[PDB]
């Protein structure tokens, strides 16, 4: 039983004394401010626990309790989302008419004329239209009343209180020892089996006993207050067997392995529900039940306390071949002694999963009536692309913090890390060449087209009409997925998504999903994507690989992860740190994700979204202009940015005037950021000197001597306002555009 619970009791005293002493956590900051730099250095380094403490135990304790604090905030956030749905929303009116009522769960106070924001969202209601997709979640959950939304809100508040108690309790009363945190086999067994496996299984149970009966009655057309309460399905097994006759047999088919009996509610239909335009919830129930089984199975792989299981160290040390030296030896020690190495992996994977979520949810719309709510489809795609891109760049941020700090060459001799660092010139030169090739052969095709169209030579352009760059591999994969039902997925009845080909699914005369054809414009913008992702990898990988040393600076690890430069010598070493590649790679992430959401927005409006009428033909939002106009930059400028900015500019005096104001406000913040990005600290300190002089003249100089921001903080402030401004402009542009027309 070497996997055991070990706790120090009453480690840290619950006292308000350190609250009154800002900066108590570091030796530099605890002696108080003398310049204004102290104030900024206080906020900058506060959650950098491994910069304050030497011991991995105290660092692990601070992290565990801070994760409870984060959970408490998320539960509070969720509880408020339910309460605004319960109290300030048109949810009940939306349940009766999901295709007519626009979801709204935010009402403004009348103060300075701002009550114009309470627009007519429908259902005898005035409020701010919400695009987070909660209404579609709640109907998928089977909520059907505001009373149940109040109970969910209380359930979030109780959980929110319990997490903040646990964070206090596990830091101040019962803090686990380092040997508790260093149980990677136990944690993985429980997080696969217990968290993910029982998470899916329990949710499958809710889906089967609550979501499936309630949503069958809704899609049959029964009024929400005419629907039995969710526990009457749990007790009256006769009533549940009316909707799904397999329930007449109970749990004998489950235990005797006669699973085919359960095909009423555990289907493999594929495609969409014609009534709601969403995934069949009988499929999602089977999906979560099947996922639950193999998460519970996966969580029995590793060895804890009984000899059965794998040692993760043994798996890693055995995988070594003739190209890779000692192989994965020493990686277990890295990943059970470095939190940053763990955070680097988990941020890159969570960011990747968030990017996948964006693609899977628009193409295979999971919730009822979310596919034809186009403001939600655009909002949750754009939101989850940004979460993914940010989290991916923090994976390289913390891979750099690992390499600078937690990397020890003595324990990493001739293994995979040692070998990567020892040919990093070959990696970075090959990536650099790919990015030049990719930029020339993706963006240069656009420049070729701008010139040819401007020169009157439309026969010389790369277009469907002219020279054709077809995406044959993507078209071929689309062919296979339409052929899969009955052929390579024989028991499936419909395709995984109608985006691959097949029918047009219409709900309330609006397209839910329909085949997303790929042409020359799709070939061009996909290689635009591969170029922007590869350059982002190039900037971030070069920062991780050269974080400790270069040919330029032989001792970059002694300067740290985050330093501004090593002087104007060697020609100039401005922005040479690993932090400065995260800084430069967040711009190229911003560039990458901006083109992705622009590609998504224009393609869905031009080729997918719109209205169906007689003869079954579809009138799209921008009328199919993507194919012949997304091949030039002038087409993107004119037919996408200029044409679709009309709604946000003409929004003044409407309920969308808030988006019009945020459009201008974010344009401001973006431009203001360039003051911090294009300027240097030395100018601003000398300007402050004259301002200090005028204060000295009036005897009003401060005792905390004002300083210009650090070189790094000028970069961090410039990047933050650039991101706030750039993303905030697109947020207003996307939301005012798609609320008006979709």
């Amino acid at each position: 039983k070497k996997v055991s619970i070990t706790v120090d009791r009453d480690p840290v005293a619950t006292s308000f004394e350190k609250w009154a002493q800002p900066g108590h956590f570091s030796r530099t900051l605890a002696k108080g401010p003398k310049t204004t730099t102290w104030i900024w250095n206080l906020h900058a380094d506060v959650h950098d626990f491994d910069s304050h403490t030497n011991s991995l135990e105290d660092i692990s304790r601070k992290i565990f309790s801070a994760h409870f604090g984060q959970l408490s905030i998320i539960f509070l956030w969720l509880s408020g989302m339910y309460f605004h749905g319960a109290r300030f929303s048109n949810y009940s009116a939306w349940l009766s008419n999901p295709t007519a009522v626009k979801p709204s769960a935010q009402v403004v106070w009348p103060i300075v004329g701002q009550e114009v924001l309470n627009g007519d969202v429908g259902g005898g209601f005035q409020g701010v239209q919400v695009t987070s997709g909660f209404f579609q979640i709640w109907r998928s959950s089977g909520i059907t009343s505001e009373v149940e939304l109040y109970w969910c809100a209380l359930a979030g508040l109780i959980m929110s209180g319990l997490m903040i108690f646990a964070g206090w309790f596990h830091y101040h009363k019962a803090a686990p020892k380092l040997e508790w945190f260093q149980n990677a086999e136990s944690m993985l067994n429980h997080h696969l089996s217990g968290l993910l496996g029982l998470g899916c299984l329990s949710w499958a149970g809710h889906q089967i006993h609550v979501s499936l009966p309630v949503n069958k009655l809704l899609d049959a057309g029964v009024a929400p207050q005419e629907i039995p309460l969710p526990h009457e399905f749990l007790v009256n097994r006769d009533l549940m067997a009316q909707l799904y006759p397999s329930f007449s047999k109970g749990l004998v088919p489950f235990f005797t392995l006669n699973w085919s009996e359960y095909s009423d509610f555990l289907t493999f239909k594929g495609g969409l529900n014609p009534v709601t335009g969403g995934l069949w919830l009988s499929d999602t129930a089977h999906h979560h039940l099947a996922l639950a089984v193999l998460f519970i199975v996966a969580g029995h792989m590793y060895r804890t306390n009984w000899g059965i299981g794998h040692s993760m160290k043994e798996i890693l040390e055995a995988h070594k071949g003739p190209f890779t030296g000692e192989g994965h030896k020493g990686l277990y020690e890295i990943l059970t002694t470095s939190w940053h190495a763990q955070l680097a992996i988990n941020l890159a994977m969570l960011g990747s999963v968030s990017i996948i979520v964006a693609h899977h949810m628009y193409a295979m719309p999971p919730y009822p009536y979310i596919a034809t709510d186009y403001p939600t489809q655009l909002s949750i795609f754009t939101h989850h692309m940004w979460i993914g891109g940010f989290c991916v760049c923090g994976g390289a941020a913390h891979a750099g913090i690992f390499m600078v700090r937690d990397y020890n060459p003595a324990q990493n001799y001739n293994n995979l890390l040692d070998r990567v660092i020892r040919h990093r010139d070959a990696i970075i030169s090959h990536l650099n060449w790919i990015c030049i090739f990719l930029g020339f052969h993706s963006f240069g095709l656009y420049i070729h087209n701008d010139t040819m169209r401007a020169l009157g030579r439309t026969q010389d352009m790369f277009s469907d009409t002219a020279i054709q760059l077809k995406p044959v591999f993507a078209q071929w994969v689309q062919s296979i997925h339409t052929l899969a039902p009955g052929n390579t997925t024989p028991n499936a009845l419909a395709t995984a998504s109608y985006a691959f080909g097949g029918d047009v699914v219409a709900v309330g005369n609006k397209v839910a999903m329909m085949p997303i054809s790929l042409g020359t414009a799709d070939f061009m913008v996909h290689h635009i994507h591969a170029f922007t992702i590869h350059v982002t990898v190039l900037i971030l990988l070069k920062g991780v690989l050269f974080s400790r040393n270069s040919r330029l600076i032989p001792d970059k690890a002694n300067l740290g992860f985050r330093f501004p430069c090593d002087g104007p010598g060697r020609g100039g070493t401005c922005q040479s740190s690993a932090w400065d590649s995260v800084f430069l790679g967040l711009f190229w992430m911003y560039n990458c994700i901006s083109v992705v959401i622009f590609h998504f927005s224009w393609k869905m409006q031009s080729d997918v979204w719109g209205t169906v009428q007689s003869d079954g033909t579809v009138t799209h939002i921008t009328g199919g202009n993507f194919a012949q106009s997304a091949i030039t930059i002038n087409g993107w400028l004119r037919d996408f940015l200029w044409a679709q900015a009309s709604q946000v500019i003409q929004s003044y005096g409407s309920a969308l005037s808030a988006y019009g104001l945020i459009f201008l406000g974010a344009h401001f913040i973006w431009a203001f950021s360039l003051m911090f990005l294009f300027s240097g600290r030395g100018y601003w300190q000398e300007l402050i000197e004259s301002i200090v002089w005028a204060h000295n003249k009036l005897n009003v100089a401060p005792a905390i001597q004002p300083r210009a921001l650090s070189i790094t903080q000028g970069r961090a402030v410039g990047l933050a306002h650039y991101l706030l401004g750039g993303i905030g402009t697109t947020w207003a542009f996307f939301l005012a555009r798609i609320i008006s027309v979709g």
Binding site: T256, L257, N258, S260, H300, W306, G307, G309
Partner: protein, 69 residues
């Protein structure tokens, strides 16, 4: 839909076979622990029969799928 059959002694036979198959396999391949009377305990027995109900359930469903039953 893949045909499955109500529990019969044939279903039992496959399950029994699979459980025993894994009990013998577990005596051979479990690396950390009288062919079955050395070092055999409950976590070894509870693991081999857990894989038997995984292998047996898969075998039963597959043999029902193809017609062997």
């Amino acid at each position: 839909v893949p045909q499955t059959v109500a529990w019969s002694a044939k279903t039992g036979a496959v399950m029994v076979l699979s459980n025993i198959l894994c009990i013998v396999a577990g005596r051979y391949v479990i690396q950390v622990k009288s062919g079955s009377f050395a070092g055999f305990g409950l976590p070894e027995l509870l693991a081999s029969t857990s894989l038997g109900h995984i292998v047996g359930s898969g075998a039963i469903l597959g043999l029902s799928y193809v017609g062997v039953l």
